[PDB]
Design a protein around this ligand. Structure first.
Ligand code: HEM
Ligand code: HEM
Ligand SMILES: C[C@H](O)[C@H](O)[C@H]1CNc2nc(N)[nH]c(=O)c2N1
Ligand SMILES: C[C@H](O)[C@H](O)[C@H]1CNc2nc(N)[nH]c(=O)c2N1
Ligand SMILES: N=C(NCCC[C@H](N)CNCCN)N[N+](=O)[O-]
Ligand SMILES: N=C(NCCC[C@H](N)CNCCN)N[N+](=O)[O-]
Ligand SMILES: [Zn+2]
Lengths: 410, 407
């Protein structure tokens, strides 16, 4: 079957065949679309077919499909699975798998960079301290003094589901959130629950507005352990505005390294529950969502007041005006400190080019419109006008339950 | 099953069961989501009529009554004998309001029950249609205090006597292809504008020329009509701070009136059912004015604001976008012409959703269309999970007439 997607701004129509290799479900049915829904131990039996699918894809990618190497590898894995119930990926397969999980992430607008991913193999890791060391090396490498480099660190895969490696942080670097008895929130409201877990685990919180959270690391299914990332390794950017000298006085800053660490990387049926990865920020992630979401830093008012906008009626679009300036500030500050960042215009334009390229070289590019379109100025970015097809391909990055909800404490 | 939708800004979770009554396909499957795709017999008729009448009598607290059974049999006998049937005025009104109620892409549905329905089912000619339309335009415009309305022309029969309004909206500006290769006026209407010329219209070759109505009655060829200029309310766009804004020579019409959709009620199809409400600011300021394929005025506005357009990261496009939208709203409010900003409209929809969930078990909504084209996440709907599904009565898209009309 063939599926056409059209860009209503350019009339460019693309054809998708890649979706044919989509196995996982989407949540939608022929009677209902769940396209805006945030989130709608294996047996030897269902493992080899998953392994075979992957290895076939891998060997096909290196132009060795059907080769003796390919056939031996399949037999090797088959025997290993029957012999040990699981199997180990070769380093090459790991790197290939990691890159493709990114390539397949339909909610990621930065995928034009997928082939350039530095993969750190941390499968020989056995303890939390070991994980800490690996993560520090990842942060230092990825940060590269402001010239950010995409990277992923992969810890040991799941075995029986009772020895999982997990990074309890949702992101390697995030600011603590603190619920005050008066009901107000200090810091990032999104991290209050995790911050409480850290404190409970022994973390001495400086209770500030921008305290870098400590890493809570779980190795081999053991209870997690706290570690403080060396401050000298955490790059941060003070936010100021090019024209508004008072903006800096808002006391705002943000870390330069976005590093998701709570997702599960699935490769050939294998599950890597601890696989922190990082690239670099798109301006709006911070300027629109982290700063202006009502449930996050929510700085729209204070910024609007300082700009002395007419906040008596929404129709003055004061929120919209303040929103722009704030995002101008974020981009300006990062560029000024020479810390990698990309604006939503550049990033979405790049994604369209990436997408078109993917349709031609791969027959498609699963994309989640709801997530791809920036949270501000939607229609003035090309992606808004681009029809997209969302489906799931493996390898992939999947959500997994928060560890504190499933962990058996020792 | 019983699906739930969560709002990630307020954690509020709502359960949807209304979807369990959906009958039409969405275009999606268990393997692929087409949520961002813009356009994914007597035997067939009675079940549809039955479905409708059942919900109708259910809505009037007379489900399973003799009146219900009687009507059901009457329509039944009517279909068997006439291969179709006629809706009672009451059923017509109910159906029209519900088609709106079910429009998953409309953010202004909190207004659904206040629709004024004009029964034009006795219409027979294009002049008759013009008369009905003029009356609709004047009624809905209400000197600037817009009132929602829909005018329903005769239902489909054998498909060869279909009533159709060729315009996409009762009021739109013409578009002409110039030698320069550029486009004069609204690029979106270039084709229709030519079909008017190709039909007789004398285009003034302007930037904002109110197109003429092309009405089709009983399948006959369509006829042109100039909407009494005095009936077409327009708003000059000026900025509440940039005195130079007026120099752009921009203006827009106050009445948004979709006229190319098909109203489906109890299996019956009304191919000519122009309807109107009022504008949400972004429709004009963001889409009509800033879309690259539309009046695409960002650069011009940017230049006059004298901001660095060298780098995209200066966010000049964004800065200018806001000003253009502040101007649109300002101009409409200044001239006392109804209009709603995206913040207010989205706030209303969230409220509407909640009402619909507790009063009807849900609300089909298309997130992709509901979220405004600018400042998405600072509006509540961005954080609102929505379930999209099709319910009837409904407003459906239909082929442009000039691609099906046999002159
Ligand atoms: C090169 C820089 C990159 C940029 C500019 C970029 C940008 C983005 C943005 C703007 C989002 C949306 C975030 C949100 O709204 O929460 C996102 C999501 C995502 N990206 Fe990328 N990304 C980049 C690198 C990466 C890397 C290195 C990976 C993996 C190897 C990746 C995997 C994903 C995934 C899985 C999601 C969805 C996460 C979720 O569902 O919460 N991205 N990316
Ligand atoms: C009272 C004021 C109303 C407001 C503020 C409102 C607002 C909107 C907006 C912003 C859109 C999207 C427009 C676009 O992007 O093209 C829309 C679409 C739509 N509205 Fe409403 N609406 C109103 C009244 C009506 C009425 C009276 C009806 C029907 C009786 C209606 C039926 C629909 C339908 C079917 C669509 C989708 C049209 C399409 O697919 O192109 N609306 N509305
Ligand atoms: C309910 C809705 O799915 C939700 O708010 C989504 C919308 N689009 C998004 N897009 C991105 N990039 N990130 C998000 O967190 C979201 N949230
Ligand atoms: C491709 C994508 O579906 C398309 O650009 C949609 C997105 N959302 C929209 N939303 C509204 N209200 N109106 C539109 O015309 C669109 N266009
Ligand atoms: N740019 C990236 N973005 C994703 C992580 C940062 C997101 N703004 C935080 N999302 C929090 C979960 N709702 N990732 N990256 O690796 O570069
Ligand atoms: N507000 C309304 N909007 C819909 C019609 C006007 C839209 N801006 C035109 N969209 C063209 C279809 N792609 N309708 N209304 O009845 O109020
Ligand atoms: Zn879907």
């Amino acid at each position: 079957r063939f599926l056409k997607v059209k860009n209503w701004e350019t009339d460019v129509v693309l054809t998708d065949t890649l979706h044919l290799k989509s196995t996982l479900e989407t949540g939608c049915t022929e009677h209902i679309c769940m396209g805006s829904i945030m989130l709608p131990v294996r047996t030897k039996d269902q493992l080899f077919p998953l392994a075979k699918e992957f290895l076939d894809q891998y060997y096909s990618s290196i132009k060795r499909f059907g080769s003796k190497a390919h056939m031996d590898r399949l037999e090797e894995v088959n025997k290993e699975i029957e012999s040990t119930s699981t199997y180990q990926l070769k380093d090459t397969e790991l790197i290939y798998g990691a890159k493709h999980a990114w390539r397949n992430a339909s909610r990621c607008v930065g995928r034009i960079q997928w082939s350039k991913l530095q993969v750190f193999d941390a499968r020989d890791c056995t303890t939390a301290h070991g994980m800490f060391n690996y993560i520090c090396n990842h942060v230092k490498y990825a940060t590269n003094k402001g010239n950010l480099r995409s990277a992923i660190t992969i810890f040991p895969q799941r075995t029986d589901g009772k020895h999982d490696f997990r990074v309890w942080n949702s992101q390697l670097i995030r600011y603590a959130g603190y619920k005050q008895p008066d009901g107000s929130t200090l810091g990032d409201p999104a991290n209050v629950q995790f911050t409480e877990i850290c404190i409970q685990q022994g973390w001495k919180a400086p209770r500030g507005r921008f305290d870098v959270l400590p890493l809570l690391l779980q190795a081999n299914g053991n209870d997690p352990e706290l570690f403080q990332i060396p401050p000298e390794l955490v790059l941060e950017v003070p936010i100021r505005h090019p024209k508004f000298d008072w903006f800096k006085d808002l006391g705002l800053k943000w870390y330069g390294l976005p590093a998701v660490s709570n997702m599960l990387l699935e490769i050939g049926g294998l599950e890597f529950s601890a696989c922190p990865f990082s690239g670099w920020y798109m301006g709006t992630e911070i300027g629109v969502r982290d700063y202006c979401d009502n449930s996050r830093y929510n700085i729209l008012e204070e910024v609007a007041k300082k700009m002395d906008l007419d906040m008596r009626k929404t129709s003055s679009l004061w929120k919209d005006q303040a929103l722009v300036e704030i995002n101008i500030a974020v981009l300006y500050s990062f560029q000024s400190d020479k810390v990698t960042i990309v604006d939503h215009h550049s990033a979405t334009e790049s994604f369209i080019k990436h997408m078109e390229n993917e349709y031609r070289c791969r027959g498609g590019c699963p994309a989640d419109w709801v997530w791809i379109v920036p949270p501000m100025s939607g229609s003035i970015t090309p992606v808004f006008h681009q029809e997209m097809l969302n489906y799931r391909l493996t390898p992939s990055f999947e959500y997994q339950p928060d560890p504190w909800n499933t962990h058996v404490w020792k």
